[PDB]
C-alpha cells in the first residue's frame, strides 16, 4: 500500500517546516477552516474515525458533544500525548519525528470543536521531545498560523505544552484535566462530563496524539476515502508498535483487519523460533488479556474482532512471544505495574490491586494451593465495575488472561513447589511450622518479591 500518513517515522523527510510543507502540510487550510465546524464534524461522523486511546468511541461524534462558542470563549481542546501503557511507542514517534503534523491537526480539530486553545500534555520521560516539540511550536508561531489572527481569518487558535512529571494514571481523560489545574491528578467521576464541564469550568475534549495527527489527511484528502480500510465501522489506518520476543521489534502503519500471520511475515521479522513456537500474544497493550496461540490463527486487527476473543485493540502494541518463557512472571510484572501506578482513591483498586500483587508473587514461585488459582479470579471480579476510572478494569483483565488460557501452567508450578519444597503450603503460603518469633516470620519461605529496593 502507498500513501502512508506518517512517512517520517524512519526519519527520512525532515522535521523543519520547509520540508514539512513539501511533505503535504498546510494547504487549502483557510478554505477547510472556513467550510465551518459543521462540515468538518459531518465529515467525521461520516468518516468512521474512532479513538486511538483504547475506548473505541467515535472520535468525530465525541467532538459533536461540545457546545458552540459564539463569543469564542476559552474552550480548550486537550491533545492527549501520553503513552502510559507498557509496550506502546506510537505516541513517541509522532511527537519526535512528525511534530508539525500534530500541530496542524489540533487547529483543524479545534476549529471543529469551537475551541480557542489546545494543550498537548507530554510525559516527563519525553523530556527531549518536550523541548523539541516546543521548538516546532516556535516555528509554528513565526508562520502566523496560530495566534489571535490565524491565517488572516477571524478565528484564532492557541497552543501550549503542559509537561507531566510521571504518573501512568494521568493518561485518563479526567486525570489529565486535573493535572493541568495543579491538583494531584486523580480522575473525577464522569458527571459532569468534560464535554460540558471540564478544564477551568470550560468544555474540553481529550484526544490522543495519534488521533489528532491523522485529521490533517482526512480533512484534506477526500473524506470519503477513510472508510476504505479495515472492516465496516472499524475504519481507518493504524500504527502498530510490535515488540516483545520477536525477530525485529518495529513500528508499521498497516490497516485494520490485517491477519496476524500476514503481519508476522510481511514485516516485523518473525517468531524467535518459528510460528510453531508461539506461546502468547498481548495485542493492543498490557491492559487486555493475553490471547493464546490458537486465537491468533484468524486474528484480524479490529477494535472488535480482537474483542470477540476477549482481547482488544487498545494501543495496538501487538506483543508476540515464544514458548521459552514463563508467562506467570510476565503477567506478575503487569500486576506489580498497575499497583505501583494506580492513583489510589477508589477502594477497589487502591486495595484490590495490592491483593492481586500479593498473590501473583506467590503464584510466580508456586507457593499457593490449586483452589487459590480460582480464588484470585473471584477477586478480579470484585474490582471491575466498582472503580471511578478504568485503571481498575485494566488491572484485573491481565489476571483473567492468565487464568482463562494458561490454567494448567499455574497448577504445574504449584505441583513443582510441592516437590521442590517437599511440604505442601496452606492458604496464604503458611507452612506447617511457620510462626512468629520475637517479631518476624520464621521457618517459612518469605517471598521478598516486592521489588526489594
Amino acid at each position: 500500500d502507498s500513501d502512508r500518513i506518517f512517512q517520517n517515522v524512519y526519519s527520512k523527510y525532515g522535521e523543519d517546516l520547509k520540508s514539512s510543507q513539501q511533505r503535504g502540510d498546510w494547504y487549502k487550510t483557510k478554505e477547510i477552516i472556513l467550510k465551518g465546524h459543521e462540515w468538518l464534524i459531518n465529515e467525521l461522523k461520516a468518516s468512521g474515525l474512532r479513538g486511538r486511546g483504547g475506548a473505541g468511541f467515535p472520535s468525530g461524534l465525541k467532538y459533536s458533544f461540545m457546545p458552540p462558542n459564539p463569543n469564542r470563549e476559552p474552550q480548550y481542546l486537550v491533545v492527549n500525548a501520553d503513552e502510559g501503557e507498557p509496550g506502546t511507542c506510537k505516541d513517541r514517534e509522532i511527537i519526535r519525528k512528525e511534530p508539525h503534523k500534530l500541530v496542524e491537526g489540533c487547529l483543524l480539530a479545534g476549529r471543529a470543536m469551537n475551541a480557542t486553545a489546545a494543550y498537548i500534555y507530554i510525559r516527563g520521560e519525553f523530556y527531549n521531545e518536550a523541548v523539541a516539540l516546543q521548538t516546532a511550536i516556535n516555528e509554528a508561531y513565526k508562520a502566523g498560523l496560530l495566534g489571535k489572527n490565524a491565517c488572516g481569518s477571524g478565528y484564532d487558535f492557541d497552543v501550549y505544552i503542559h509537561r507531566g512529571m510521571g504518573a501512568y494514571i494521568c493518561g485518563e481523560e479526567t486525570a489529565l484535566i486535573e493535572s493541568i489545574e495543579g491538583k494531584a491528578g486523580k480522575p473525577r467521576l464522569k458527571p459532569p462530563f468534560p464535554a460540558g464541564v471540564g478544564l477551568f469550568g470550560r468544555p474540553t475534549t481529550v484526544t490522543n496524539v495519534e488521533t489528532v495527527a491523522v485529521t490533517p489527511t482526512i480533512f484534506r484528502r477526500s473524506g470519503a476515502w477513510f472508510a476504505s480500510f479495515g472492516r465496516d465501522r472499524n475504519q481507518g489506518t493504524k500504527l502498530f508498535c510490535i515488540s516483545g520476543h520477536v525477530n525485529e521489534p518495529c513500528t508499521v502503519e498497516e490497516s485494520m483487519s490485517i491477519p496476524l500471520k500476514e503481519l508476522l511475515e510481511k514485516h516485523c521479522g518473525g517468531i524467535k523460533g518459528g510460528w510453531d513456537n508461539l506461546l502468547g500474544v498481548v495485542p493492543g497493550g498490557s491492559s487486555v488479556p493475553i490471547m493464546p496461540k490458537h486465537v491468533c490463527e484468524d486474528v484480524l486487527m479490529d477494535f472488535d474482532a480482537l474483542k470477540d476473543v476477549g482481547s482488544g485493540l487498545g494501543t495496538a502494541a501487538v506483543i508476540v512471544l515464544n514458548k521459552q518463557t514463563d508467562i506467570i512472571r510476565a503477567i506478575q510484572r503487569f500486576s506489580a505495574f498497575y499497583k505501583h501506578e494506580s492513583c489510589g482513591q477508589c477502594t477497589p483498586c487502591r486495595e484490590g490491586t495490592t491483593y492481586l500483587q500479593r498473590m501473583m508473587d506467590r503464584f510466580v514461585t508456586g507457593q499457593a494451593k490449586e483452589k487459590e488459582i480460582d480464588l484470585i479470579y473471584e477477586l478480579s471480579k470484585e474490582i471491575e465495575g466498582h472503580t471511578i476510572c478504568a485503571l481498575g478494569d485494566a488491572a484485573a483483565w491481565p489476571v483473567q488472561g492468565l487464568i482463562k488460557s494458561f490454567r494448567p501452567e499455574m497448577v504445574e508450578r504449584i505441583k513443582q513447589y510441592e516437590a521442590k519444597l517437599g511440604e505442601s503450603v496452606s492458604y496464604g503460603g503458611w507452612t506447617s511450622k511457620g510462626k512468629v518469633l520475637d517479631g518476624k516470620v520464621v521457618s517459612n519461605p518469605i517471598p521478598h518479591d516486592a521489588h526489594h529496593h
Binding site: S342, C346, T347, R350, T353, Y355, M359, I388, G434
Partner: protein, 218 residues
C-alpha cells in the same frame, strides 16, 4: 423542579439536582456509605453506596450521581449485594485487628456495616502481612492511629472547606497514600476536633478520652 422517581417501588419526590442517596434516604431505603457526609462536599471514592440503574450496565455511586426524572433505581439485587461484600472484603484487607484496643470499638461504622452488608468470613491469610503506617502527631487533642484509616477523606474535606485549615491532606500515591500533614505540625483550628466525630473508624480519636470508656456504658 422536583423530579418524581421510584426507589425499589417507593415513590420519591425530591428537589432536582439532588443525588440518588438523598432520594433513597427519603424513601426509607438505607444505602451503606463511608465517604458521604451530609455537610461535606461529595467525593465518590469509598465505592460502598453503589446501586443499579435500569438503563445501564455500570453501577452508580448514589452519593454522586444526580437524580433523574422517571428513573428506576435498584438497591437490593444480588448483583449489588455481591458488590457490597466485595468492597467490604477490600477495606478489611489492610485494616488492623485492633477492635479490642480501639477507642471506636462499640460505635464504629466499619464494624456495623461490615456486620450488616459484608460477608461473615475473611479470605486473607497472606504471608507478607498487612500494610503498616506510622502514626502522625498533630497536636494534644487528636490521637492518630493511621493503620485504621479507610482513606475516605472526611477529615480532608472538613478541614479544608468547613474548618478552613488547609494543612491537612493526602500525601503519597496508591497503596502508600498517607492522610496527614506531610511535615510534622499540629492542626490549628478551633473546630479541628470535630474531625474526631467525622472519622468513621478509629484512625482519629480523642486524646483526653483515650482508653477511658466504651460507648455502651455511657
Amino acid at each position: 423542579k422536583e423530579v418524581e422517581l421510584t426507589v425499589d417501588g417507593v415513590k420519591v419526590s425530591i428537589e432536582a439536582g439532588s443525588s440518588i442517596i438523598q432520594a433513597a434516604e427519603k424513601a426509607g431505603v438505607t444505602i451503606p456509605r463511608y465517604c458521604y457526609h451530609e455537610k461535606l462536599a461529595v467525593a465518590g471514592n469509598c465505592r460502598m453506596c453503589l446501586v443499579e440503574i435500569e438503563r445501564s450496565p455500570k453501577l452508580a455511586a448514589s452519593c454522586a450521581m444526580p437524580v433523574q426524572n422517571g428513573m428506576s433505581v435498584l438497591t437490593n439485587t444480588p448483583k449489588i449485594k455481591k458488590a457490597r461484600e466485595g468492597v467490604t472484603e477490600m477495606l478489611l484487607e489492610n485494616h488492623p485487628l485492633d477492635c479490642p484496643v480501639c477507642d471506636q470499638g462499640g460505635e464504629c461504622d466499619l464494624q456495623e456495616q461490615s456486620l450488616r452488608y459484608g460477608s461473615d468470613r475473611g479470605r486473607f491469610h497472606e504471608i507478607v502481612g498487612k500494610r503498616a503506617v506510622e502514626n502522625k502527631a498533630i497536636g494534644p487533642l487528636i490521637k492518630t492511629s493511621m493503620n485504621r484509616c479507610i482513606h475516605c477523606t472526611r477529615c480532608v474535606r472538613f478541614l479544608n472547606d468547613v474548618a478552613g485549615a488547609p494543612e491537612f491532606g493526602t500525601a503519597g500515591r496508591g497503596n502508600d497514600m498517607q492522610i496527614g500533614t506531610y511535615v510534622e505540625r499540629n492542626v490549628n483550628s478551633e473546630l479541628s476536633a470535630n474531625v474526631i466525630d467525622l472519622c468513621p473508624v478509629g484512625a482519629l480519636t480523642s486524646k483526653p478520652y483515650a482508653f477511658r470508656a466504651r460507648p455502651w456504658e455511657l
